[PDB]
Scaffold this active site. Structure first.
Site, PDB file in Angstrom:
ATOM      1  N   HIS B  41       0.804  -1.220   0.000  1.00  0.00           N
ATOM      2  CA  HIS B  41       0.000   0.000   0.000  1.00  0.00           C
ATOM      3  C   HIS B  41       0.837   1.270   0.000  1.00  0.00           C
ATOM      4  O   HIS B  41       0.256   2.366   0.014  1.00  0.00           O
ATOM      5  CB  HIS B  41      -1.022   0.007   1.154  1.00  0.00           C
ATOM      6  CG  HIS B  41      -0.420   0.037   2.529  1.00  0.00           C
ATOM      7  ND1 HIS B  41      -0.227  -1.104   3.276  1.00  0.00           N
ATOM      8  CD2 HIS B  41      -0.033   1.073   3.316  1.00  0.00           C
ATOM      9  CE1 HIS B  41       0.286  -0.779   4.453  1.00  0.00           C
ATOM     10  NE2 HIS B  41       0.404   0.537   4.509  1.00  0.00           N
ATOM     11  N   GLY B 143       4.072   5.706  10.383  1.00  0.00           N
ATOM     12  CA  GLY B 143       5.421   5.598   9.855  1.00  0.00           C
ATOM     13  C   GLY B 143       6.101   4.277  10.126  1.00  0.00           C
ATOM     14  O   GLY B 143       7.158   4.010   9.553  1.00  0.00           O
ATOM     15  N   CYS B 145       5.027   1.237   9.368  1.00  0.00           N
ATOM     16  CA  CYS B 145       4.740   0.159   8.425  1.00  0.00           C
ATOM     17  C   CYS B 145       6.011  -0.361   7.771  1.00  0.00           C
ATOM     18  O   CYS B 145       6.932   0.398   7.465  1.00  0.00           O
ATOM     19  CB  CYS B 145       3.753   0.640   7.351  1.00  0.00           C
ATOM     20  SG  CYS B 145       2.132   0.873   8.112  1.00  0.00           S
TER      21      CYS B 145
HETATM   22  C1  LIG Z   1       1.565   2.480   7.362  1.00  0.00           C
HETATM   23  O1  LIG Z   1       1.353   2.350   5.991  1.00  0.00           O
HETATM   24  C2  LIG Z   1       2.603   3.581   7.603  1.00  0.00           C
HETATM   25  O2  LIG Z   1       3.324   3.602   8.568  1.00  0.00           O
HETATM   26  N1  LIG Z   1       2.659   4.577   6.551  1.00  0.00           N
HETATM   27  C3  LIG Z   1       3.563   5.715   6.571  1.00  0.00           C
HETATM   28  C4  LIG Z   1       2.968   6.861   7.386  1.00  0.00           C
HETATM   29  C5  LIG Z   1       3.034   6.967   5.860  1.00  0.00           C
HETATM   30  C6  LIG Z   1       0.231   2.831   8.024  1.00  0.00           C
HETATM   31  C7  LIG Z   1       0.342   2.846   9.553  1.00  0.00           C
HETATM   32  C8  LIG Z   1      -0.662   3.920  10.055  1.00  0.00           C
HETATM   33  C9  LIG Z   1      -0.835   3.720  11.584  1.00  0.00           C
HETATM   34  N2  LIG Z   1      -0.811   1.836   7.780  1.00  0.00           N
HETATM   35  C10 LIG Z   1      -1.975   2.242   7.009  1.00  0.00           C
HETATM   36  O3  LIG Z   1      -2.048   3.363   6.607  1.00  0.00           O
HETATM   37  C11 LIG Z   1      -3.078   1.314   6.774  1.00  0.00           C
HETATM   38  C12 LIG Z   1      -3.425   1.074   5.246  1.00  0.00           C
HETATM   39  C13 LIG Z   1      -3.611  -0.598   5.035  1.00  0.00           C
HETATM   40  C14 LIG Z   1      -4.936  -0.851   5.062  1.00  0.00           C
HETATM   41  C15 LIG Z   1      -5.641   0.450   4.729  1.00  0.00           C
HETATM   42  C16 LIG Z   1      -4.772   1.798   5.074  1.00  0.00           C
HETATM   43  C17 LIG Z   1      -4.957   2.476   6.406  1.00  0.00           C
HETATM   44  N3  LIG Z   1      -4.234   1.924   7.373  1.00  0.00           N
HETATM   45  C18 LIG Z   1      -4.475   1.896   8.834  1.00  0.00           C
HETATM   46  O4  LIG Z   1      -3.693   1.309   9.542  1.00  0.00           O
HETATM   47  C19 LIG Z   1      -5.711   2.617   9.339  1.00  0.00           C
HETATM   48  N4  LIG Z   1      -6.563   1.656   9.992  1.00  0.00           N
HETATM   49  C20 LIG Z   1      -7.883   1.471   9.386  1.00  0.00           C
HETATM   50  O5  LIG Z   1      -8.188   2.139   8.430  1.00  0.00           O
HETATM   51  C21 LIG Z   1      -8.790   0.433  10.047  1.00  0.00           C
HETATM   52  N5  LIG Z   1     -10.068   0.836   9.512  1.00  0.00           N
HETATM   53  C22 LIG Z   1     -11.280   0.692  10.302  1.00  0.00           C
HETATM   54  O6  LIG Z   1     -11.263   0.180  11.372  1.00  0.00           O
HETATM   55  C23 LIG Z   1     -12.548   1.245   9.607  1.00  0.00           C
HETATM   56  C24 LIG Z   1     -12.422   1.568   8.273  1.00  0.00           C
HETATM   57  N6  LIG Z   1     -13.464   2.054   7.618  1.00  0.00           N
HETATM   58  C25 LIG Z   1     -14.611   2.255   8.263  1.00  0.00           C
HETATM   59  C26 LIG Z   1     -14.730   1.960   9.610  1.00  0.00           C
HETATM   60  N7  LIG Z   1     -13.679   1.462  10.267  1.00  0.00           N
HETATM   61  C27 LIG Z   1      -8.302  -0.982   9.662  1.00  0.00           C
HETATM   62  C28 LIG Z   1      -8.104  -1.044   8.143  1.00  0.00           C
HETATM   63  C29 LIG Z   1      -7.753  -2.469   7.611  1.00  0.00           C
HETATM   64  C30 LIG Z   1      -8.604  -3.581   8.264  1.00  0.00           C
HETATM   65  C31 LIG Z   1      -8.679  -3.470   9.808  1.00  0.00           C
HETATM   66  C32 LIG Z   1      -9.248  -2.094  10.210  1.00  0.00           C
HETATM   67  C33 LIG Z   1      -5.319   3.760  10.288  1.00  0.00           C
HETATM   68  C34 LIG Z   1      -6.582   4.589  10.590  1.00  0.00           C
HETATM   69  C35 LIG Z   1      -4.268   4.662   9.572  1.00  0.00           C
HETATM   70  C36 LIG Z   1      -4.772   3.226  11.634  1.00  0.00           C
END
Ligand SMILES: *[C@](O)(C(=O)NC1CC1)[C@H](CCC)NC(=O)[C@@H]1[C@H]2CCC[C@H]2CN1C(=O)[C@@H](NC(=O)[C@@H](NC(=O)c1cnccn1)C1CCCCC1)C(C)(C)C
Ligand SMILES: *[C@](O)(C(=O)NC1CC1)[C@H](CCC)NC(=O)[C@@H]1[C@H]2CCC[C@H]2CN1C(=O)[C@@H](NC(=O)[C@@H](NC(=O)c1cnccn1)C1CCCCC1)C(C)(C)C
EC number: 3.4.19.12
Lengths: 306, 306
Positions: B41, B143, B145
């Site tokens: 991603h 950050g 990931c």
């Molecule tokens: C990682 O990629 C990173 O370190 N990136 C560097 C900063 C630029 C990053 C870590 C952020 C804490 N991970 C993500 O961004 C992932 C990717 C992979 C899957 C989708 C996106 C977003 N994401 C997240 O970790 C998010 N978590 C969610 O979006 C949950 N969503 C919900 O619970 C939900 C969603 N829609 C409606 C209602 N609820 C996850 C998503 C995947 C399945 C389990 C639930 C955040 C919000 C960034 C923590």
């Protein structure tokens, strides 16, 4: 989010560990530049341990009584001196892997990482705190002497602890890297008591702030308190008294959460007098005191190192 | 003696971490031989995350859309392919610091060390367990990931986990190094529930043996039980059922302490039904389930690594 007992990355230290043998005793040494540091009781036989005269015992040793091994490389000892309770062995090869380092003596309540080693090889890394009675609750077996504790500041390694002995209570004692014991202990096999251990109050407060940052907020209350009134309840429960210096050091966590330090103290006051009543904080049913305020900032803001 | 949550020494892994950028997204990669592995991603914008078509999105990317940095060295991407949920970037420089490694997929209840990284640099190391519902209770910020989990067998590093996302409950999910998620999750921003979490019974028993080895023995009793009778009480308390395979794996700890596995189960049975009543085991007021039997043997016998 989340909160774990996190150690410092240990790479910079692993390349400094050596094996030191003298007689039938093998333990670990710290190899920085052309000096190997190790506990001076490596020179003792079991019978010397009751009442050693280390000056006289060291005088009877020659440079070739010391075998120093860095994996396969055999280092040759060129000189040997004693600084307090640590032995300094000068060697013929400087350590190419010598990081940028300093020697520091930490204060009770501060934390550090321990790299547990046997025969000069790493077994594991873990985080602990210097207790108020100058012991540490470590995990060490026979052969671990000379393992070290350390912190990391970007690219600098601060060495603060070398392991020497275990007390019959299961806790551990050692020196700084200039050879001075933490606490009142001496390296002889006699009964020596550690002081009363107390709970590190500033660290408990730091951990309560970590819990708030992580959304665990049930324990917050409306009340407030003065530093003196708090300390009266704390001392009843064997908590360290809190000082104005402690309030200052908690400043950054206060600023980030918007919760005044004295308001957090008012929450801790209630926890002590009423207990936790089957609830948990950050997955614990006890009040945790082995994270400093700096540990919490570091882990909740993602500080990295060179 | 003593007992700590001990991580593996992280040196061999630290030299494999790189920074990967694509567009405005920077995260971490794993650099082994001439391949850099990272979460796929990295190619997504915030708007793609709701319903990404990764095949189509990757086709629109060229090799020079990927910036890969190893500290100061700029690696040049020669190729890019996708394996399940991980991106493989081929590069022009092989990693001289590549350890002896393999890729393994662990089972629920097993433990590993996490090296938390930001921008390709290490922040800290900690131990955790793969939960029965295939999440981990980690400590990760924006950050992180691409940070990895690993075990060490003497001189071999087994990589078992790469971090991808955080669930709204504060727990974490990711893949093995062939790109397959642990658990039922997909890398899209939709609501996805984790199963019910249960307590890892074989690990609780391992930790009770660790407590006996460390002299904490108040909970032992005369009673005995059958595996079926134990499991009836366990399932009421949301404990994993114990199998004969689990009894076998506890064999070494049974042999060393002289306490039959089914006798330890009879002690755990009473702890569950009566509680701990203000006592602690190894300094905890909760039953700990994040040490495997092998963790206990390793820490109580001082196994080391190359
Ligand atoms: C990682 O990629 C990173 O370190 N990136 C560097 C900063 C630029 C990053 C870590 C952020 C804490 N991970 C993500 O961004 C992932 C990717 C992979 C899957 C989708 C996106 C977003 N994401 C997240 O970790 C998010 N978590 C969610 O979006 C949950 N969503 C919900 O619970 C939900 C969603 N829609 C409606 C209602 N609820 C996850 C998503 C995947 C399945 C389990 C639930 C955040 C919000 C960034 C923590
Ligand atoms: C360390 O040198 C090592 O790893 N050596 C490699 C294996 C060959 C070794 C670690 C053993 C767990 N440390 C020691 O051997 C030290 C040295 C330094 C001080 C004296 C000897 C023994 N020793 C210990 O750690 C012992 N601990 C004690 O002897 C306690 N003694 C008593 O509590 C006591 C003594 N006499 C009468 C009644 N009680 C300590 C000694 C120092 C002050 C605090 C109490 C053992 C028993 C090896 C843990």
């Amino acid at each position: 989010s989340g909160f774990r007992k996190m150690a410092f990355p240990s790479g910079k230290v692993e390349g400094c560990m050596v094996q030191v043998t003298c007689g039938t005793t093998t333990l670990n040494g710290l190899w920085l530049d052309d000096v190997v540091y190790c506990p001076r009781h490596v020179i003792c036989t079991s019978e010397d341990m009751l009442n050693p005269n280390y000056e006289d015992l060291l005088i009877r040793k020659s440079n070739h009584n010391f075998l120093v091994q860095a994996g396969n490389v055999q280092l040759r000892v060129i000189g040997h001196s004693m600084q307090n309770c640590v032995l300094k062995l000068k060697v013929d090869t400087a350590n190419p892997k010598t990081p940028k380092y300093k020697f520091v003596r930490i204060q009770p309540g501060q934390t550090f990482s321990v790299l547990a080693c046997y025969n000069g090889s790493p077994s594991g890394v873990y985080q602990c705190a210097m207790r108020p009675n100058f012991t540490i609750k470590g995990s060490f077996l026979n052969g671990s002497c000379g393992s070290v504790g350390f912190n990391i500041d970007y690219d600098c390694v601060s060495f603060c602890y070398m392991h020497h002995m275990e007390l019959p209570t299961g806790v551990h004692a050692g020196t700084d890297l200039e050879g001075n014991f933490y606490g009142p202990f001496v390296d002889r096999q006699t009964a020596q008591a550690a002081g009363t251990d107390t709970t590190i109050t500033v660290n408990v407060l730091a951990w309560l702030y970590a819990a708030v940052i992580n959304g665990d907020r049930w324990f917050l209350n409306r009340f407030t308190t003065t530093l003196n009134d708090f300390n009266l309840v704390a001392m009843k429960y064997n908590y360290e008294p809190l000082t104005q210096d402690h309030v200052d050091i908690l400043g950054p966590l206060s600023a980030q959460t918007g919760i005044a330090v004295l308001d957090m103290c008012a929450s801790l006051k209630e926890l002590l007098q009423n207990g936790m009543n089957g609830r948990t904080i950050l997955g614990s049913a006890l009040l945790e005191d082995e994270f400093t305020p700096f540990d919490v900032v570091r882990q909740c803001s993602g500080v990295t190192f060179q």
